[PDB]
């Protein structure tokens, strides 16, 4: 708010003994404003309690390594079909994830042709999901430049941009990203894992250079992919393994019988 | 965020957690470190002894750069050897060919003597050295070379 809002009056308290509350009051006469209360957060036309300031903290620092961790985790989530379906993408008619498409798609220049490719590789149902999800926003946000809302579509990741970016700008819901600059806002929108990602072959073959492997250092200086604290995540197989079952006592009843 | 604060939980309770008798008032006890010698002496003498008074001598226009002398102990000294040739140096080093360790170029002012060296000759370059640090360096067959 403005620093002087509610403070542009010369009001003073009447003090006590005039049978009114002790809040400051506008002086003078001849207008209905005369005698009215001023300055207080409870007063009409006063200043608000603790007026908002610009030096509130707006941006937040995150450790760069942890941010890279989250990026890697979101990339891994995009290859899990259950996560992609839970995230809401219409990937029921795609044979396998990751979906990798040939590099000829990096040179498509017209929107019609790019939509043809999306239909062919079975990603257009998710675009149709975006088209039919358009709604007027609920509440005063529509007064503030955020008039419509819709779902997010697929993310197309390329190694070379020979027209693919411009060919896809006008398609509702579709996002494009260079394989060199991938971020969490595109990978886990709303903090929800499992973005539908369409890799070109060049980008898919560049991933191992970008993030590194056992055989290849990351191009990120001094960076290595994170290790898990557990090596086999299927704990049921671990528990029901021959090593474990050889040292467990026989199990009791699932529910104890009522004895008394 | 405001939704997780206790201000939200105090809504509907008269005193906002500040008590009916005591009544959160403006500055009972004074502002800042007021009364450190009078009614806050029981805090300062207990938790901050030494607070009041003068000790030692003044130093006008103190330049902290005169006193720059980062310390490195002997137990850490081999970290300065190149990491790719450390294993080789530990085996091949002799009185006629020993590793040189330029501690000042690595940003250190004095070599201190905590810890134990590998039983391998070294040549240690330093601005300053402690008596025991040099004695331990000479005992594994090494030497300290003063640089400026």
């Amino acid at each position: 708010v403005a620093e002087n809002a509610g403070h542009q009056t010369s009001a003073e308290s009447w003090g006590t003994g005039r049978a009114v509350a002790r809040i400051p009051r506008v002086g003078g006469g001849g207008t209905h404003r005369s005698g009215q209360a001023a300055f207080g957060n409870m007063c009409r036309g006063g200043r608000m309690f603790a007026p908002t300031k610009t030096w509130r903290r707006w941006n937040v620092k995150v450790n760069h390594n942890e941010k890279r961790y989250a990026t890697a985790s979101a990339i891994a989530a995009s290859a899990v079909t259950s996560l992609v379906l839970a995230r809401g993408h219409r990937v029921e008619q795609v044979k396998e994830l990751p979906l990798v498409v040939s590099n000829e798609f990096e040179s498509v220049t017209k929107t019609k042709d790019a939509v043809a490719v999306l239909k062919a590789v079975g990603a257009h149902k998710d675009v149709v999901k975006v088209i039919k999800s358009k709604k007027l926003r609920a509440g005063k946000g529509k007064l503030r430049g955020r008039r419509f809302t819709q779902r997010r579509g697929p993310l197309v990741v390329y190694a070379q941009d020979n027209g693919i970016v411009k060919a896809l700008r006008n398609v509702p819901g579709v996002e494009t990203a260079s394989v060199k600059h991938l971020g969490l806002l595109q990978l886990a929108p709303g903090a929800h894992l499992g973005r539908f990602i369409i890799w070109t072959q060049g980008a898919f073959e560049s991933l191992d250079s970008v993030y590194g492997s056992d055989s290849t250092k990351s191009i990120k200086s001094g960076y290595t992919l994170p290790s898990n604290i557990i090596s086999n995540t299927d704990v049921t197989r671990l528990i029901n393994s021959a090593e474990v079952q050889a040292v467990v006592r026989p199990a009791g009843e699932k529910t104890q019988k009522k004895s008394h | 965020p405001t939704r997780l604060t206790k201000t939200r939980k105090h809504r509907g309770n008269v005193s906002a957690g500040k008590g009916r008798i005591g009544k959160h008032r403006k500055h009972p006890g004074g502002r800042g470190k007021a009364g450190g010698q009078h009614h806050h002496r029981t805090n300062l003498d207990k938790y901050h002894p030494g607070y009041f008074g003068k000790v030692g001598m003044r130093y006008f226009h103190k330049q902290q750069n005169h006193f720059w002398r980062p310390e490195i102990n002997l137990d850490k000294l081999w970290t300065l050897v190149d990491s790719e040739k450390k294993d080789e140096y530990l085996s091949k080093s002799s009185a006629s060919a020993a590793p040189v360790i330029d501690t000042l170029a690595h940003g250190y002012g004095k070599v201190l003597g905590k810890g134990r060296l590998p039983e391998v000759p070294v040549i240690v370059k330093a601005r300053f050295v402690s008596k025991l640090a040099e004695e331990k360096i000479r005992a594994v067959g090494g030497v300290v070379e003063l640089v400026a």
């Binding site: - | 502002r31 470190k33 007021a34 009364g35 170029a105 940003g107 008596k131 300290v144």
Partner: protein
């Protein structure tokens, strides 16, 4: 006012501090505009480099002796040794510093070497030079092409040579000699004059 076991703080907020708050909301905007200014300035004078060549100097202060950095300009002696007049050096992308002096040999040699490298890579165009040769060159980054390089610390292998006096004793004696120098040479006189 003073309460439970906590560090005593020094928060200097007793003036009208809120009248003097500078929030750098324009950090990204100034980055972008500073970048656009560099672009326009470089395009104005291409293929001439934007940066003048700078000398290499030792940093002062026993804390920063070990380091070497870029200086303000080459000395008059450094330019004299390469055969370049100070008023001419400014017209060919070489900085000049009439204030810096060359008391030693090492920095002088390093900068004379830098100047010779720059002169070897320099091409001065004239009215005979055609547009096709001017178009042949790309605007070179001078501070990247002639970087300031830290001399490498001594490493590798060398013979061990143990003096009989320890380094520690050498340092103690040097301190003692410095400390008592004044009074010992006062004693030397007053004993001598009494002879």
């Amino acid at each position: 006012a003073i309460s439970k076991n906590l560090p005593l703080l020094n928060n200097h907020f007793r003036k009208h501090w809120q009248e003097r708050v500078r929030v750098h909301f324009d950090q990204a905007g100034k980055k972008a505009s500073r970048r656009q200014s560099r672009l326009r300035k470089a395009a104005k004078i291409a293929p001439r480099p934007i940066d003048a060549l700078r000398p290499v100097v030792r940093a002062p202060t026993v804390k920063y002796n070990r380091k070497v950095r870029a200086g303000r300009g080459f000395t008059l002696a450094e330019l004299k040794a390469v055969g370049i007049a100070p008023k001419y050096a400014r017209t060919i992308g070489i900085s000049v510093d009439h204030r810096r002096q060359n008391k030693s040999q090492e920095t002088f040699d390093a900068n004379v070497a830098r100047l010779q490298e720059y002169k070897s890579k320099l091409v001065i165009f004239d009215k005979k030079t055609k547009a096709s040769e001017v178009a042949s060159f790309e605007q070179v980054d001078v501070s990247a092409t002639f970087p300031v390089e830290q001399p490498a610390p001594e490493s590798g292998l060398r013979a061990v040579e143990v003096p009989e006096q320890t380094a520690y004793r050498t340092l103690r004696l040097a301190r003692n000699e410095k400390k008592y120098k004044g009074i010992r040479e006062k004693r030397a006189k007053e004993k001598a004059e009494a002879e």
